[PDB]
Write a protein that binds this ligand. Sequence first.
Ligand SMILES: Nc1ncnc2c1ncn2[C@@H]1O[C@H](COP(=O)(O)OP(=O)(O)OP(=O)(O)O)[C@@H](O)[C@H]1O
Ligand SMILES: [Mg+2]
Lengths: 53, 498, 62
Amino acid sequence: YYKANVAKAGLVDDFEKKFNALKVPIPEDKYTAQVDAEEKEDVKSCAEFLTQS
Amino acid sequence: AEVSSILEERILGADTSVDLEETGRVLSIGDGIARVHGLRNVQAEEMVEFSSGLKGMSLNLEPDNVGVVVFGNDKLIKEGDIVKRTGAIVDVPVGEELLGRVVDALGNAIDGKGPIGSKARRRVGLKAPGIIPRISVREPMQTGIKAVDSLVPIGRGQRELIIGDRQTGKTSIAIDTIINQKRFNDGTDEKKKLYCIYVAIGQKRSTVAQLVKRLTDADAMKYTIVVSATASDAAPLQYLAPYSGCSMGEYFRDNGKHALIIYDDLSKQAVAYRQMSLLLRRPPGREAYPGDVFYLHSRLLERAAKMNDAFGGGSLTALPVIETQAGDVSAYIPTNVISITDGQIFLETELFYKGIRPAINVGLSVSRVGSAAQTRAMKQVAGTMKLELAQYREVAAFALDAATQQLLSRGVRLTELLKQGQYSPMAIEEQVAVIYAGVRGYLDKLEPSKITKFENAFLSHVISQHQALLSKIRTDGKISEESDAKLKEIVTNFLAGF
Amino acid sequence: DPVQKLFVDKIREYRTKRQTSGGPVDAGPEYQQDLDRELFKLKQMYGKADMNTFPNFTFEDP
Ligand SMILES: Nc1ncnc2c1ncn2[C@@H]1O[C@H](COP(=O)(O)OP(=O)(O)OP(=O)(O)O)[C@@H](O)[C@H]1O
Ligand SMILES: [Mg+2]
């Protein structure tokens, strides 16, 4: 419909095709470095605190 | 290129036929009223036309001349002009073709967007349905405001009245009601779809434009008609806009569908009628309003019926909006319309500024249908809420013992529960969840300044984690024992976890 | 239908305009002044982005 309602159908076709080809990025888990903390907890909870308790 | 082609397409089809038509000469034109001489066979309240394509209504049939009111501007009509009778009582287009279109009081498209494809016309001045066609109001009209759906419920075929001062939140209630119907209109069953009509009388064009864009943003013009007779439209148009809109809704209710119409305001239709009547020289009455000022409204609000299943089963709800002066509900038009309508919704500025929004004065607001036209879950919960607020309002003017202290606590918790924002109507099951949480002593622990935070967070949590429970409540339409136990555990868990 | 001399007259004037529409005839300076004014207003209301193609993003992670 839209390209049927525009004069320079070529330009809108170009935008449509560029949209189709081009995608968007996605973040990562670098800010999830807190992964490390979990292991540390295993020490107090399961190794240290558990044992002396 | 094709622009001129489509331009020609219009000329290609024209009106060749010239007929021998009766006429009359304008003896005197001034203030919007013409006194035609001739038109010996013109009917009463018939539509006539002027030499410049401008319409009018023959309202007065005196022996020597016909008093005609011009549906438009008056500078273009001269003396000795020509008035041709169209031989048809005033009527307007009707049909689903009008949905999503802004039209003027006479059914002319006002937003561009081409013409109306209506295949049928209906007379504005039609008699109300008799006593036999109707049937008691059964279904609920879901408004989305907690305080209206719980404490002053509205059925389909009822005629509520939204009465208050200027800038207390009346049009806001109207728009919330219009927007809420989106969930039902998007669904599949046609027994819940409700087509909305908004008659804007005397409102400046900027206000109606804001309203129309607000409806478009909420994607609510798929099923809304807007009949705008704004301030700059001659009085004969603001007088007739309510009747045009009511005919557009009469079509729906007569074709088995459901419609909702919102006259906004009727206190300005009364003023336009008074101006017309005073310029036709009819003697004034009390406050200068004509004698037939009650009739004006009673014949209009009596068309909001609830047809029985033999006449289609369709319905037409009405929500007239009145505007009082400094809360003087005792005025003339307010009292007329209060004695015409079924329910009322009193908005008060003292409540608007005290933080209670919508300002609905639950103490005075009434609804004759009451019990009927309320879902079973809401009926169960809002009853206890109503009793609790009724008791609270008695002992409220002050602020000891545990029993009355807890009574005040519960009343205040419920009060802050009923507040709401703008253009965010709630599904009925969500309202039931919130009111159930509030009324079952759960919020009595929380502070009253944090109740809004709870309400909001609880809604956001339930709408995602417990969509299944809300679907159950909606489908079964009651708080069953298992549903009650669930609700109990969800609320108990959430309260502590917050 | 071939009798409404003004019907065919209007059609004839329309045809002549169609033929003569190489450039807006009788445009006058008002044509350009308006065109510019409302194009400018639309440009403001929409935006000042790169009015040929897709602007790029370069988003930022949390
Ligand atoms: N539930 C609400 N929460 C917050 N603000 C509200 C609410 N309802 C209304 N308002 C405010 O009240 C103002 C007036 O609203 P509205 O137009 O609905 O009242 P009104 O009486 O129809 O006004 P008028 O009669 O002058 O047209 C709005 O600016 C709006 O911000
Ligand atoms: Mg308003």
